């Protein structure tokens, strides 16, 4: 299917305790392949997938240089934004940046994005056409005017539509043995008695990749969101993911309920029923 390369950058100020924490991570689809952490020993960009380890010293030196530049910008930004909102020096604040690119099944450029948040909510973002900005408030409009004066959108568009996709294609080829794989979910159902007259049915998907999946409950063939619970899709730790969906039903009526599982690895969606 489609593929993505995404970088995630987090900086957290530490009032009265020095320089901000800075963490960068890179993903291809749902697979992490690099990291930088200010807390760690190397102070370099580091590999987290075997297929990126093979890149030579100039790659790692370059990525280290650039990611350090990202860190510096965030450190300045924390002070700048503290100024924009006239906040005190007493509080910790957060800057987050995410950017990257999607290609389709044909590996051709599909879309690009760049989003920026202050203290956990939208601050400024590139619009879909990659030619203008959306600012959250007047403070963010200051940043918008600065980035317009510096023609950031033009430069960034050149990266997202070109360089980003070139890297993504290189990585997709070099890591093909693991990145271009589909692991179908292993499914099963469990039952709990809530009371003498109510029961929980829990529908399980395990060991799947990519992370994208849909679990739905139906009663008599009709969608049911009432009395249902969906947990966040979670990493197993081996490169695969897990998820479950539960519904509370009247005891004796279990047979009316079906769990439906949609995944890339299931050309035909699955329908599970309690025994």
């Amino acid at each position: 299917g489609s593929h993505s390369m995404r970088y995630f950058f987090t900086s957290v100020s530490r009032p009265g305790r020095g320089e901000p924490r800075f963490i960068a991570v890179g993903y291809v689809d749902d697979t992490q392949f690099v990291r930088f952490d200010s807390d760690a020993a190397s102070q370099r960009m580091e590999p987290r997938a075997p297929w990126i380890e093979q890149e030579g010293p100039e790659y790692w030196d370059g990525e280290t240089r650039k990611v350090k530049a990202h860190s510096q910008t965030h450190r300045v930004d924390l002070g700048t934004l503290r100024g924009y909102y006239n906040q005190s020096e007493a509080g910790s604040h957060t800057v987050q940046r995410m950017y990257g690119c999607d290609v389709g099944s044909d590996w051709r450029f599909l879309r690009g994005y760049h989003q920026y948040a202050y203290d956990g909510k939208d601050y400024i973002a590139l619009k879909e056409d990659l030619r203008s900005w959306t600012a959250a408030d007047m403070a963010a409009q200051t940043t918008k005017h600065k980035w317009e004066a510096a023609h950031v959108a033009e430069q960034l568009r050149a990266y997202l539509e070109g360089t980003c996709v070139e890297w993504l294609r290189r990585y997709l080829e070099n890591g093909k043995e693991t990145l271009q794989r589909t692991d179908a979910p292993k499914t099963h159902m469990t039952h709990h008695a809530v009371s003498d007259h109510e029961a929980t049915l829990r529908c399980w998907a395990l060991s799947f990749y990519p992370a994208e999946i849909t679990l739905t409950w139906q009663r008599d063939g009709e969608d049911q969101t009432q009395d249902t619970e969906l947990v966040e899709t979670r990493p197993a730790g081996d490169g695969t993911f897990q998820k479950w969906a539960a519904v509370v039903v009247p005891s004796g009526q279990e047979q009316r309920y079906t769990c439906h599982v949609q995944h890339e690895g299931l050309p035909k969606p699955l329908t599970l029923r309690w025994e």
Partner: peptide, 9 residues
Amino acid sequence: GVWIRTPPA
């Protein structure tokens, strides 16, 4: 590979 550098806000 990451973007070359980021502009200050």
